[PDB]
Write a protein that binds this ligand. Structure first.
Ligand SMILES: Nc1ncnc2c1ncn2[C@@H]1O[C@H](COP(=O)(O)OP(=O)(O)OP(=O)(O)O)[C@@H](O)[C@H]1O
Ligand SMILES: Nc1ncnc2c1ncn2[C@@H]1O[C@H](COP(=O)(O)OP(=O)(O)OP(=O)(O)O)[C@@H](O)[C@H]1O
Ligand SMILES: Nc1ncnc2c1ncn2[C@@H]1O[C@H](COP(=O)(O)OP(=O)(O)O)[C@@H](O)[C@H]1O
Ligand SMILES: [Mg+2]
Ligand SMILES: [Mg+2]
Ligand SMILES: [Mg+2]
Lengths: 438, 114, 383, 380
């Protein structure tokens, strides 16, 4: 009875230290606290010495006393994975929060997996058309690649990821996994009602024909829950990729909140802070997360991750670290949105590995490079036009400004998910129409 | 709660422990009864490599250390102040503070004879 | 409180013995009541006091050297970095979840070393020397230290031989030498990996045309990149044939911080074999600004005091002692050369960053890639 | 040579002398006569200074529990440590000494919620400051409640009329929404908020009781004079019948300014949970982040951007996710938040500004250029 049972030594916010007198759990092993108002799952983060582990609580620690019995589960956080998770909402620790009964688990997987090895990498640069003009033209998305939507709090990376759900996941043949990390709970409820209404989530007996799993760790949760709910979404996606052999879609709203939750818990783990205030382990935590999302030889994951830049600073270390993990960045800008252009994609800051003449053809590539050349020549003239006016420009440059002001209105597009508050109906645009227009 | 005043003020965390030890030994008229006990425990750390293991090894648990110190001093002909001091220093692994508590106790004691 | 009466206490002054003969025959029957709770004492082996975030504080390990490979009992290797008075700070070459408090740490006797030789020519390697391409272990290869001091003044000679890169903007305006350190610096997605890759492809095209001694063996160190990019680069180098002369050292983003810290030194030690055996080497440290970040994490978790942008104070020495190993040796040392192409990513064109200014002050040349020249059609975007 | 290992001691537990003195004074044969230090449900102050008291003992205290000092000032057990409790003082810390007795109350930090709070001016802890006696028809609930989940909510359907023409036409605001009122100093943010409260009074007499809106106005870091003038306004417009006012002014301690939005949010969550409709205004939520930054830097936590703590986003997301529209199996009630963020020179790309923009549903940008051109309300 006394074996495998530690007691709480100290409670520092979401960081709990548990003293195991008999035998210590492993790092990343999950613990459970006895006698709490909710199910309080701790995850062991450090061994501090003196028979003490240092844990990170998955729920709130308010109400914890420093004598409370803590049971080692002997395992990391295990969540239900399988086709029985489809059409269900689950939290960070795999509990069904949709009030539809328990989740019929095909298996229970640890949420901490090693990244797939170098021999299990698939290098197939295939395009994924989204119907968005600026996305399909200037930075096309890979079919089995990682996609970033960089944004600055109000520029439209939730409307863009909802339009990508509307356009891509309906034409897709596999399963989608939406991981909500640190976003609004109203947005999760809106997505649940829209997915129930559109039929991709079915309730009751026809639940097996639902094609989407929601994993929600929203911004009302403590930083222990927002730090590991992306790992739960990855586990549900990795079961479909590895075991089921499917092609998976994985939409992660605000992958920044994983980094922010780790920086929140890192100040109480007793670390010296790195640059502007983040944890010292930003790059390795982000790498250990993002290298689990990989198109392997036995399955593909098309990952679209919204990334939030904190104060419209792209030089902030948490988006600057994220930039090196993605195949196609779609940097949304505040100034493009203030011009009224939606989607507010910066054309001279969004890049992709698919913009190469040998993979998308020379015509599409030459059109995208010509549009970028005209936009860069207009951005070079942004100071002369401001302080002198357009009447002092050369006759060849006024044509450049006119064609650039035409192509930067033409990059904008109405969305089917934005028609509820804008009134105009959405437009899906084929790729050949975009190249033929530009 | 009324404790006799120490003859001189001293430093922190290993001299105020000796100051408190002198303050509670002067209440029981028990200064020279615990001074030789401090010296005897210094000789005990000199003798056994298994009793100074409790002061230096950080892998013995605090339960095991407190149970060695408590079940070794079963009233031992000794003062209760010494026994309630060493199971208190064994509860933190602060047994290495004995060799400076003895220095500050020597300072208080030879300041006690002016 | 001073040490003189504290040394006088070493002389016995007990004056009574009514506890000493009582508890000395009472100690050993008390200790034997708890001998299953005792762990065996440790002197020349080690034992983990505390483990977390990739750092193990190891009790014991009396005769370890600084910078020495250690091996935990769970098989994962380590590196004794700061040897403090009561513990050793060991960085973990891998995931530290298999390390517990009380795990035995074993000293291996060796300072950290990688396999160097002709057997690495064609393999995809991690930052420690193990092959990750799934083609078996390394054959026809020998172990060499990753902390070789750079050749001095009398060992070098003047840089004369060209080593063309095949990029005519570079070979026309910023001409490389065969023992020269040339920094490719720019923002993200401005074509730095493209310049280094085209240099490697041009060495493949020139190695089938020159007589056996101007042949250039490339070594690509991928620090902090993702594994899909490294696999795409291996596919490129095999589908063009450049993998016959190329070694790839790959410490990806999923690897530990000491692996990414140590992978440029592993790649430089693998490339120094060709420099020391009369051949000519080409080393590309892609994302040296990620090796600096891994070093920052590794040193901050060792509780060393931070500096500019929370970097260590000795982050200049980290890149200076790495890049100074790229030399052109004298005729009595073979005449072999090693030319470095470190890569630094800047943030919004800020050249005045800490690591950027350090590596500019270290290397010989500079290759600046502006993101406004890139979008004006000028590819490569050479400033 | 055998005593060279003990020539300097190294240990944890900085309060080692306390654990030695709790063993040595009962070794005296005189002071086993009920001279015990109470350490189970009581505790002695070790240190006190800059609004944080370190308290020995309290071995049965919970994390986040409201404790009470012997002076009468209350506190909150924030850091439960191995040898002490880090208590955050909910008042002036000048009345706390070393060796003061700290009693635990047995309850997580709570405020009175209910229909007895309507009409009453309150500080950030629940006790009234309008001088009208204690809160009578009321009961205590926690200030730190987890927000309702995904099933517990439904889509926002019903309109909350502000009564402002520029607001109700161009940025319409539904019941259960969170609408940021952002702008420079003296651009009319408080005017929009109090027009909303007065208009809820004007519409409350013409709807049935299941459609009335009960307002909470949290004033964080304001002057006490402007709070008194606003209480006179809500009394002379009849709006105090449906309005609670929580008031953590600029003279109050920064833990009270940190906790007053959560206190007011619990007082409005009563109306949300009992099927009625609530409207809460966090006036100058930037000042709450300033108070929390003060508490974090005095707790020696490592600061991030603009010296703010890392959990300053969590500070406002905890608060604003509790404003929701509940589902039909939870009573169907709603809570509407109006957080107010003040910007410097119209910089809305600041840290706390962009944090609350990425939390709330919409924004009311009040431009400082239109406010001086006579265009009032200066809605951008
Ligand atoms: N000479 C060139 N002609 C046409 N396109 C090029 C050229 N050089 C680079 N590019 C394009 O620029 C993009 C970025 O290339 P590269 O990866 O070399 O830059 P990088 O700075 O290494 O990027 P990152 O910072 O993400 O590592 C690639 O998609 C590539 O197709
Ligand atoms: N619609 C309006 N018409 C005329 N005057 C107005 C209007 N709104 C506000 N004012 C006046 O302008 C001033 C704005 O004060 P208010 O408290 O509304 O701004 P505020 O943004 O809260 O400023 P602060 O944050 O500094 O208190 C007040 O003196 C008020 O009398
Ligand atoms: N494609 C679009 N069409 C019309 N309006 C848009 C579009 N994208 C964004 N917006 C506007 O910008 C705001 C962006 O909000 P959101 O999608 O939540 O972005 P973020 O998550 O970055 O804050 C919305 O309030 C919406 O009014
Ligand atoms: Mg969003
Ligand atoms: Mg690169
Ligand atoms: Mg105001």
């Amino acid at each position: 009875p006394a074996i495998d049972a530690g007691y709480v030594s100290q409670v520092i916010g979401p960081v709990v230290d548990v003293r195991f007198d008999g035998e210590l759990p492993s790092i990343l092993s999950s613990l459970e606290v006895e006698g709490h108002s909710v199910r309080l799952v701790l995850e062991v983060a450090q061994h501090m010495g003196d028979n003490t582990v240092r844990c990170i609580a998955m729920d709130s620690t308010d109400g914890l006393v420093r004598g409370q019995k803590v049971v080692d589960t002997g395992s990391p956080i295990k969540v239900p994975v399988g086709r029985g998770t489809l059409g269900r909402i689950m939290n960070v620790i795999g509990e069904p929060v949709d009030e539809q009964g328990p989740i019929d688990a095909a298996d229970i997987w640890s949420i901490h997996r090693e990244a797939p090895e170098f021999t299990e990498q698939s290098t197939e640069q295939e395009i994924l058309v989204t119907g968005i003009k600026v996305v399909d033209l200037l930075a096309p998305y890979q079919r089995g690649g990682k996609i970033g939507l960089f944004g600055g709090a109000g520029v439209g990376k939730t409307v863009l990821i909802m339009e990508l759900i509307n356009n891509v996941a309906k034409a897709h043949g596999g399963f989608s996994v939406f991981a909500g990390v640190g976003e609004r709970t109203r947005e999760g409820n809106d997505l649940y009602r829209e997915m129930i209404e559109s039929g991709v989530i079915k309730l009751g007996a026809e639940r097996g024909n639902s094609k989407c799993t929601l994993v929600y760790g929203q911004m009302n949760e403590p930083p222990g829950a927002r730090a590991r709910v992306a790992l739960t979404g990855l586990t549900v996606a990795e079961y479909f990729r590895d075991i089921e052999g499917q092609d998976v879609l994985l939409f992660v709203d605000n992958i920044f909140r994983f980094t922010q939750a780790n920086s929140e818990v890192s100040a109480l783990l007793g670390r010296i802070p790195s640059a502007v205030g983040y944890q010292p382990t930003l790059a390795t935590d982000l790498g250990g997360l993002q290298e689990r999302i990989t198109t392997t030889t036995k399955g593909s994951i098309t990952s679209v991750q919204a990334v939030y830049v904190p104060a419209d600073d792209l030089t902030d270390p948490a988006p600057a670290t994220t930039f090196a993990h993605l195949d196609a960045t779609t940097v949304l800008s505040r100034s493009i949105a203030e011009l009224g252009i939606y989607p507010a994609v910066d054309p001279l800051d969004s890049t992709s590995r698919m913009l190469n003449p040998n993979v998308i053809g020379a015509e599409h590539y030459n059109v995208a490079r010509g549009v970028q050349k005209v936009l860069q020549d207009y951005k070079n003239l942004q100071d002369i036009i401001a302080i002198l006016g357009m009447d002092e420009l050369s006759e060849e440059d006024k044509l450049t400004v006119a064609r650039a002001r035409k192509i930067q209105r033409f990059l904008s597009q109405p969305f089917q998910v934005a028609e509820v508050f804008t009134g105009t109906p959405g437009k899906y645009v084929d790729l050949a129409d975009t190249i033929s227009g530009f | 709660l009324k404790l006799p005043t120490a003859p001189l003020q001293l430093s922190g965390t290993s001299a105020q422990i000796a100051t408190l030890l002198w303050q509670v030994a002067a209440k029981e008229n028990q200064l020279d009864k615990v001074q030789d006990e401090l010296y005897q425990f210094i000789e005990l750390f000199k003798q056994h490599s298994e009793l100074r293991r409790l002061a230096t090894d950080p892998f013995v648990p605090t339960l095991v250390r407190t149970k060695i110190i408590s079940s070794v001093l079963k009233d031992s002909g000794a003062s209760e102040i010494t026994k309630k001091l060493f199971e208190a220093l064994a509860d933190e692994g602060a047994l290495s503070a004995l060799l400076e508590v003895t220095v500050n106790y020597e300072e208080l004691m030879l300041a006690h004879k002016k | 409180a001073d040490a003189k009466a504290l040394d006088e206490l070493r002389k016995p002054k007990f004056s009574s013995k009514y506890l000493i003969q009582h508890v000395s025959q009472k100690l050993i029957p008390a200790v034997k009541e708890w001998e299953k709770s005792y762990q065996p004492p440790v002197i020349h082996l080690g034992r983990v006091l505390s483990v977390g975030d990739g750092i193990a504080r190891v009790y014991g390990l009396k005769s370890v050297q600084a910078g020495e490979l250690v091996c935990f009992d769970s098989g994962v290797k380590g590196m004794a970095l700061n040897l403090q008075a009561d513990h050793v700070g060991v960085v973990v070459f891998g995931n530290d979840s298999v390390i517990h408090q009380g795990d035995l740490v074993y000293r291996t006797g060796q300072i950290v070393n990688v396999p160097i030789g002709p057997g690495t020519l064609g393999r995809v390697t991690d930052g420690l020397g193990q092959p990750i391409d799934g083609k078996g272990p390394l054959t026809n290869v020998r172990s060499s230290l990753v902390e070789v001091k750079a050749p001095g003044i009398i060992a070098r000679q003047s840089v004369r031989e060209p080593l063309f890169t095949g990029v005519k903007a570079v070979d026309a305006l910023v001409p490389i030498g065969r023992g020269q350190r040339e920094l490719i610096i720019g923002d993200r997605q401005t074509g730095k990996t493209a310049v280094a890759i085209d240099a490697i492809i041009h060495q493949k095209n020139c190695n089938e045309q020159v007589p056996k001694a101007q042949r250039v063996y490339c070594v690509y160190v991928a620090v902090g990149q993702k594994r899909s990019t490294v696999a795409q680069l291996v596919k490129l180098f095999t589908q063009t044939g450049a993998m016959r002369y190329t070694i790839m050292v790959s410490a990806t983003a999923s690897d530990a911080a000491p692996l990414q810290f140590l992978a440029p030194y592993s790649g430089c030690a693998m490339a120094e074999y060709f420099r020391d055996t009369g051949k000519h080497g080409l080393i590309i440290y892609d994302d040296l600004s990620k090796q600096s970040v891994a070093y920052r994490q590794m040193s901050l978790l060792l509780r060393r005091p931070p500096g500019r942008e929370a970097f260590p104070g000795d982050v200049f020495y980290l890149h200076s002692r790495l890049l100074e190993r790229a030399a052109k040796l004298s005729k009595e040392l073979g005449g072999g050369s090693l030319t470095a192409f470190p890569v630094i990513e800047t943030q919004a064109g800020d050249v005045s960053a800490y690591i950027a200014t350090n590596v500019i002050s270290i290397t010989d040349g500079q290759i600046f890639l502006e993101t406004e020249l890139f979008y004006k059609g000028i590819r490569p975007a050479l400033n």
